[PDB]
Amino acid sequence: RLAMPIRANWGDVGKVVTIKNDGDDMNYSAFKLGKLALLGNVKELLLYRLVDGNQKKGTLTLKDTTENSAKDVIKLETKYPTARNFNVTIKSNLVDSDKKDFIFFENTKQLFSSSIKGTIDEIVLEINSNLDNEYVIATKVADSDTILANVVNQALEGGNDGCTSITNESYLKALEEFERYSFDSFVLDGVADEALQETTKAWVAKNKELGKDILLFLGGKTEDNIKQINDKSKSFNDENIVNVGSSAYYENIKYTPSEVAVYIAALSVSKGITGSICNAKTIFEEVEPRLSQSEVKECLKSGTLVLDFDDGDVIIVDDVNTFKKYVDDKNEAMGYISNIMFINTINKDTSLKRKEFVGKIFNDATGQTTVICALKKYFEELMSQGIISEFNVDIDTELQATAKADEFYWKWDAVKVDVM
């Protein structure tokens, strides 16, 4: 599962929606960066749409002609809001007068065409249920059995572009709504703007205080050189923050480091715990600027995730996070995204065990033995799976020394496989 704040003219506004294996334009992030998430083969993708406040749905009302005075019976509107030139053409059927042919356009090409007898309920049901109407909803104005008036190419109007303006207040809606939900990772939609990235960093720190250790993925802007890339990657020093360094090509677009971070997050989530992207090839056709050994070392030292064309294909140079500018108490393995998500999953499963031990167990020696034995059992199962080479889980005597009667602190420390 991955979060996506797509800056898209298409998509449901102000709400999180999941997408199965089933937007399309290159200007809308639902496909421009929806592709970067989808191609990583994450099991499920959950999206959010960034839209300016002044933006609503386009609508279109239609009336009848069986009675000598026309009266509204059918209304049409976009499935999600947009100002796109989505037209509808309705023509009398050639064979039977009662039947009406309902034609829909994206811009001008025939998106849909079908004929229904004339009853309003079946017409709206055809315009809703049928697959070609993924871009449009029909709604009934009133119950009737009359024939509609003939119209041609009626654009659904009454809204604005979802890409009307990318702003901090517009951007923060995604994070505010993602507060409720939990994800393996969240990634910025390519806007390598310092205000947006820093607001996201503060938001993720808050969620960390809540125990929601969602993985944040980022990158510098196109104009950033190795100097600016490294400066901005060093500016963040969170275990959950990742700053992709280089721009990349997939087919046509010079995807910015922030944009490429979408595909890096998709790879990280799809890999899970077992797979690491330390030297994993990537589908990108090219990456620039080229990085030597010194440039690679400086970028990694600055917490930058580096993609380089040092072989036949683009290869992620290392699976590093912005915490690579480490501290002495934590080893360098702390500063690796696979290990970070592994630790967050451990924290989540131990939180589940905490829900399994709510207080019904007394805070005596016996309850301590019970809880630590349950944790030992879980880590032993992980060891049998081969994920853990060695672990030691024991009481957190320092925090348990000052712990009150109602609180209980423990700790764990486990080692994992290396890959060179």
Q: Which residues bind other proteins (CB under 8 A)?
A: 365-366, 369-370, 373-374, 377
CA distance 382 to 407: 27
> Could you tell me if 162 and 55 are in contact, meaning their C-beta atoms sit under 8 angstroms apart?
yes
Peptide bond into 257 cis (omega under 30): no
Nearer to other proteins, 107 or 369 (CB): 369
Q: Which amino acid is at 128?
A: N
Nearer to other proteins, 139 or 369 (CB): 369
Tell the smallest beta-carbon distance from residue 395 to other proteins (Å): 11
Apex 18 CA angle, 51 and 321, nearest 5: 80
Nearer to other proteins, 97 or 366 (CB): 366
Nearer to other proteins, 107 or 366 (CB): 366
Apex 238 CA angle, 210 and 387, nearest 5: 80
Tell the smallest beta-carbon distance from residue 356 to other proteins (Å): 10
Nearer to other proteins, 358 or 365 (CB): 365
CA distance 164 to 408: 51
Tell the smallest beta-carbon distance from residue 357 to other proteins (Å): 10
Nearer to other proteins, 351 or 369 (CB): 369
Q: Which two tokens stand for residue 112?
A: 């849909």
Tell the smallest beta-carbon distance from residue 383 to other proteins (Å): 13
Residue 359 zone, left/alpha/beta (φ > 0; ψ -120 to 50; rest): left
Q: Which residues pair with 410 in a beta bridge?
A: 395
Tell the smallest beta-carbon distance from residue 375 to other proteins (Å): 12
Helix (H) or strand (E) holding 209: helix 194-209
Nearer to other proteins, 357 or 409 (CB): 357
Q: Which residues pair with 215 in a beta bridge?
A: 185
Closest CA to 269 of 219, 342, 332: 342
Q: Which two tokens stand for residue 413?
A: 């420390």
Tell the smallest beta-carbon distance from residue 350 to other proteins (Å): 16
Tell the smallest beta-carbon distance from residue 360 to other proteins (Å): 10
